[PDB]
Design a binder for this molecule. Sequence first.
Ligand SMILES: CC(=O)N[C@H]1[C@H](O[C@H]2[C@@H](O)[C@@H](CO)O[C@@H](O[C@H]3[C@H](O)[C@@H](O)[C@H](O)O[C@@H]3CO)[C@@H]2O)O[C@H](CO)[C@@H](O[C@@H]2O[C@H](CO[C@]3(C(=O)O)C[C@H](O)[C@@H](NC(C)=O)[C@H]([C@H](O)[C@H](O)CO)O3)[C@H](O)[C@H](O)[C@H]2O)[C@@H]1O
Ligand SMILES: CC(=O)N[C@H]1[C@H](O[C@H]2[C@@H](O)[C@@H](CO)O[C@@H](O[C@H]3[C@H](O)[C@@H](O)[C@H](O)O[C@@H]3CO)[C@@H]2O)O[C@H](CO)[C@@H](O[C@@H]2O[C@H](CO[C@]3(C(=O)O)C[C@H](O)[C@@H](NC(C)=O)[C@H]([C@H](O)[C@H](O)CO)O3)[C@H](O)[C@H](O)[C@H]2O)[C@@H]1O
Ligand SMILES: CC(=O)N[C@H]1[C@H](O[C@@H]2[C@@H](O)[C@H](O)O[C@H](CO)[C@@H]2O)O[C@H](CO)[C@@H](O[C@@H]2O[C@H](CO[C@]3(C(=O)O)C[C@H](O)[C@@H](NC(C)=O)[C@H]([C@H](O)[C@H](O)CO)O3)[C@H](O)[C@H](O)[C@H]2O)[C@@H]1O
Ligand SMILES: [K+]
Ligand SMILES: [K+]
Ligand SMILES: [K+]
Ligand SMILES: [K+]
Ligand SMILES: [K+]
Lengths: 257, 256, 258, 258, 256
Amino acid sequence: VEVLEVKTGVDSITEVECFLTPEMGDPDEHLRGFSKSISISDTFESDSPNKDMLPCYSVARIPLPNLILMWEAVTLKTEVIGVTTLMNVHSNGQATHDNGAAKPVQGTSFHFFSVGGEALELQGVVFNYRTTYPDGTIFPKNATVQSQVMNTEHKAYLDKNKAYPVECWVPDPTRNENTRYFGTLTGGENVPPVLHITNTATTVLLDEFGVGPLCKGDNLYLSAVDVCGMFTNRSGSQQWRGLSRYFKVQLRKRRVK
Amino acid sequence: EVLEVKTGVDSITEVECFLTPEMGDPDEHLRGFSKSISISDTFESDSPNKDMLPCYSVARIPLPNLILMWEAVTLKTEVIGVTTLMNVHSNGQATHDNGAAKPVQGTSFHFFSVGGEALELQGVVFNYRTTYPDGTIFPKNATVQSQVMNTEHKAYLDKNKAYPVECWVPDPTRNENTRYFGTLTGGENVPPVLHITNTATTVLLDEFGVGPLCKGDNLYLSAVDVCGMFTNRSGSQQWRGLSRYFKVQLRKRRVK
Amino acid sequence: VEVLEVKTGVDSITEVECFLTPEMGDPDEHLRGFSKSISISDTFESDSPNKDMLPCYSVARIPLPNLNILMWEAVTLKTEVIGVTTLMNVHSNGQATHDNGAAKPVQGTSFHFFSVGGEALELQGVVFNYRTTYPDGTIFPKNATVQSQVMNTEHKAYLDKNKAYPVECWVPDPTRNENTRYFGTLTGGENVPPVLHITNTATTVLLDEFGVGPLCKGDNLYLSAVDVCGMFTNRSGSQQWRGLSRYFKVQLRKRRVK
Amino acid sequence: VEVLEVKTGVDSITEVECFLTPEMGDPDEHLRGFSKSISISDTFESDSPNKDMLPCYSVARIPLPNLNILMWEAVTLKTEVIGVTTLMNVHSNGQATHDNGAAKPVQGTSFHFFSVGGEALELQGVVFNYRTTYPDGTIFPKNATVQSQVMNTEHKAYLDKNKAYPVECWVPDPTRNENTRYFGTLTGGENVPPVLHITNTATTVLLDEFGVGPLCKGDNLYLSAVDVCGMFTNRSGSQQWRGLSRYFKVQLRKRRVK
Amino acid sequence: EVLEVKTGVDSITEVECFLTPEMGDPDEHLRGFSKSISISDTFESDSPNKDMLPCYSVARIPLPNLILMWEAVTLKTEVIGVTTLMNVHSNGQATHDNGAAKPVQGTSFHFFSVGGEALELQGVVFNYRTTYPDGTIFPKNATVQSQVMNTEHKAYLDKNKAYPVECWVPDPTRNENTRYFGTLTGGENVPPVLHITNTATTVLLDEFGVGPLCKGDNLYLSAVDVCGMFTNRSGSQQWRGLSRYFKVQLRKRRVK
Ligand SMILES: CC(=O)N[C@H]1[C@H](O[C@H]2[C@@H](O)[C@@H](CO)O[C@@H](O[C@H]3[C@H](O)[C@@H](O)[C@H](O)O[C@@H]3CO)[C@@H]2O)O[C@H](CO)[C@@H](O[C@@H]2O[C@H](CO[C@]3(C(=O)O)C[C@H](O)[C@@H](NC(C)=O)[C@H]([C@H](O)[C@H](O)CO)O3)[C@H](O)[C@H](O)[C@H]2O)[C@@H]1O
Ligand SMILES: CC(=O)N[C@H]1[C@H](O[C@H]2[C@@H](O)[C@@H](CO)O[C@@H](O[C@H]3[C@H](O)[C@@H](O)[C@H](O)O[C@@H]3CO)[C@@H]2O)O[C@H](CO)[C@@H](O[C@@H]2O[C@H](CO[C@]3(C(=O)O)C[C@H](O)[C@@H](NC(C)=O)[C@H]([C@H](O)[C@H](O)CO)O3)[C@H](O)[C@H](O)[C@H]2O)[C@@H]1O
Ligand SMILES: CC(=O)N[C@H]1[C@H](O[C@@H]2[C@@H](O)[C@H](O)O[C@H](CO)[C@@H]2O)O[C@H](CO)[C@@H](O[C@@H]2O[C@H](CO[C@]3(C(=O)O)C[C@H](O)[C@@H](NC(C)=O)[C@H]([C@H](O)[C@H](O)CO)O3)[C@H](O)[C@H](O)[C@H]2O)[C@@H]1O
Ligand SMILES: [K+]
Ligand SMILES: [K+]
Ligand SMILES: [K+]
Ligand SMILES: [K+]
Ligand SMILES: [K+]
């Protein structure tokens, strides 16, 4: 519970570097990074999305050098990987007008990443409490009408990949003391992706007392969502498209009592 | 007269809570939504029903009993459930043949305040002939001048689910003991832009280093988070709101 | 004016707090804060807007406590647009955006402007179309020529009267106004969304690069504003400007001059 | 030049204040500030714009008080687009946005540019379409080849004449202009809304990383501008560029050199 | 082992150049444009022609022959010919009856890098069954995983007119000796926003005060400036690119 001094010297720092692949639904063997085409329910009550149509949170647990000392995460560099793929406007999309190029990926996006010393803590909130979330996903159980705004029963850990749908979970702001998270939802069928890349930007993960996430059990938890928008097919059907996210985290050894 | 800050383990406290949105809640299935919006045929016949009108949210939070007063110093705040807006499959209006449903979008109002007493309101109406319904508190004796400024319309945000958003704003002539922040983004097609993080803190101290001072040991939190409108298959539209998280740090302050 | 030292002590500071109502045209007894429906001229040459169709600059001259050499110096401003949430009334004789939808909200061209000075705001006249006939009861650029469409230095005036100076044919004169601080944004386009921020935590400092604010000649403070938020479209499709009031709070201190 | 110390004393500073009028084409005696209606050629090969359809760079060479070794050094700039509120004239024979609506406001592609230098702005020619035939009375890239569509180093010029250098075929040469500070933004798209800010509280410092402003050769200051605000759409749907004048205020100090 | 910077005469140098865009150049009159964009008949049959594919630009600049190494410290950069997008009078598609031509708009990628060796690339494809054309260098043995991340796709940007923009990005796992900056703005109607000035400088030093160190006395500059698409009268669309200016200041640094 008590945080003491940082250890210095040769052995005292380490670095984690990896990428998290997006989990958009992957409806067949050719469509890694895409969801199933989105269909609309016949009535509000009958909302019942298939699993392959639901983007999910990505998570990786990274083992750290075995070490009371704990690894403290201090800085992060992060980047969406493959932003230029959205320039492919020639692959059986929907022409914007007669003889025009294909409509590029656009519309509702969620870009989110977190670094923590334990699993990201989630709070469940649903657009429509009568939505039936599908077998194979982990979703708010015993949803009530109050779950449309806040039901404190819906607590969970982001402890599994391809499992927690993006639309029914958010980071729990009442918890997550040992995690730093950042996200933006940009909503609207025509919103343009705006994706920046650079290897010169660093986020500092230290809190107001100068303490970063402390890695319980010598594990680092990285989480992400990068739903870039929707690809529209020639027919007008639409699929979520996601991209991978790069993480580089620097850690240092911190003594605790 | 504000004197010194108390120190010691006993001298700080924290409030953590959420305010649910008050969008109208037209039936047992529609918490967080308004009634579908209908348009009056004339200004004179504008008479919105209560469940069609988003209202201000407010909570009065009792603090440990204490001349000392609790002083609100910092705020962390967050809109809860931003990702619900990715549900584009729930009997909405397809954007084009075979496409996904139109997402929630259009006019938004995102607002929050922290004070040591009720938020002070000034009434202003789009149309003075609008008749606000029973069960709401609204500018009384509205005149055509109420469309721009009528100083008679003063109130306190002292009741949840009662003060309609569209006819009240924070009174800039008062609110010395409150800090408030809001943004109205208009237009039927404006995209929600909702940021979340647990790394952002707002300092509530004024230019003299003094934060809101909690009269009778009560903290007042207020919010509006109308995110936009949901469009049904039929084309009818309902406001959709989300809850707001507040975490406030307070310290004891001696006053004269 | 040679500016010398600031006075201190309890008597040395004062504060002005008020609001300026918008002057959008007010075409009937039910339409305060709106203009008349906008009509388009048959030809460029025949442009001839009626008074109730033209938003005008707002101005207030606030007398300050008498001093006399001392002048009141305006140091800080807090300001806010009043009634931003009125724009959420999309249920009141508007035009549905699509079948069964809500009304189109106020949107399109906006001008948000405010100034604080120790004398009247100085104006330069510029016209979109020099053959526009501005109406009786307004004060407009006189003897307009084709050069008035870009810059004609004859068109100088003072913002010295309310409901009088149309917004479209006057701007702050950047060649003058040394004793005023002004700020404005024109956001064009027929569909631009209003973005209106409110807070009581923001202050603007009015001091120039030498540490001197507007000095109030004859102990009067001049506040000016325009807050055209956009156009309201009614059910027939006709459009009217909609404006809102602006709050001002200004802190002043006594400054000796020679 | 070796740059040495700045002179002090009352005589050591001077100010320049002026405005540059826009040069949009001026197709007739009533249309100062506008271009001719814009037409579209059938092929790249057949592109042949009329002179009065082409906006041009504006330039003023301002003589300064005679010095001779001392040179005037430009230190600060205040600048403002003049007449931003003219864009609120949406009643002057424009095209209704929809039935009973107000006229479509000026919008679409804009270029806002200004520069301050101690010699003429240096230009590099680049063309959208090398087969464009530029008209008599303009100065344009000569001997254009297909490489001129991306970069042909033959097209060097000085902005040394008003109403002459079309905006679309010239830019500031980033390989030169050491003795000039320039700033510009092109915002494209047929529906981009103008966003025009005005204030008299904003100053740009013109000093480089070594603390040295433009040094005025022969005691002349060179000011250049373009303010294409967008296009005006007439009732018929024809479109014309609309520009506005730009105010400059420059502070200069005396600098010794060798 | 990076040691001290040399000072004095001949201890600094400057590189100035421009990189032309490589958009495909489909004929002798269309330098700076791509071929008209065609849409494949099926997802599987995606097979873009070379002249339809913008590529990364690169230049290797020899430095004064020099252990000392040239260290890149600052960059000034600018897109050249921004005003060409005001040509809305040639061979375009009127935005409405009697209107000017639709200007260049839609998807853009603006990117630049400075390094002391070739930019390192990671391949990522929109569609793994896309057949990239002869004469381009593209991710080989692409699998479905290549749609998100296949670590087999590594390359150096070591050739002009060869690496298509759409299937390569800077590799964030490498490039320790390069500084790179890019923005993808997607959507068919996005307006170009192009700023020019000679007053902005980017500093190339890392968190330790060390800039790119130029191996073999070569400086590597890379760029893409796809500004958007030009629409012809027929509605067919072509990518349009512009050149990029670079000015880099370098100093001599001793190393062990
Ligand atoms: C290849 C294709 O996209 N086929 C479409 C088909 O397209 C034809 C149609 O537009 C006709 C109309 O005239 O024109 C044909 O092309 C002609 C061309 O215009 C003409 O100039 C030339 O001379 O001749 C040709 C003749 O061939 C078009 O080929 O339209 C139908 C009806 O809209 C589509 O059927 C629907 O298929 C659905 C599943 O298929 C897709 C899809 O959703 O569209 C195909 C996508 O390519 C695929 N995308 C990806 C990234 O994999 C998606 C995706 O796998 C899933 O959605 C994932 O969930 O599948 C679905 O079965 C629906 O029920 C059918 O109506 C047909 O696809
Ligand atoms: C379920 C639904 O949305 N029903 C609509 C109905 O929809 C039918 C219509 O689009 C026809 C058109 O051909 O097609 C039917 O579907 C067919 C499908 O296209 C075809 O491919 C397939 O093979 O066959 C089916 C046949 O079923 C559609 O089902 O349209 C009517 C007329 O527009 C709607 O009537 C209006 O209902 C209003 C109240 O209902 C709603 C609403 O406002 O739209 C339903 C919303 O789902 C509900 N939303 C939520 C979040 O709860 C709202 C909401 O509760 C309130 O608005 C809150 O105030 O209510 C209203 O009664 C109005 O007067 C009716 O005209 C019908 O809803
Ligand atoms: C007064 C007017 O705008 N007349 C245009 C005419 O309008 C008709 C309207 O008066 C009547 O009520 O309804 C009918 C429909 O039944 C019409 O809408 O419509 C004509 C056909 O489109 C136009 O003819 C064109 O005129 C051009 C030159 O005139 C204009 C122009 O539109 O380009 C008139 C503009 O007011 C003027 N604008 C300014 C700011 O001066 C421009 C401008 O001077 C030039 O464009 C500068 O280059 O000129 C051409 O002659 C064109 O060929 C012709 O079809 C009537 O103009
Ligand atoms: K269900
Ligand atoms: K009524
Ligand atoms: K007239
Ligand atoms: K030609
Ligand atoms: K293929």
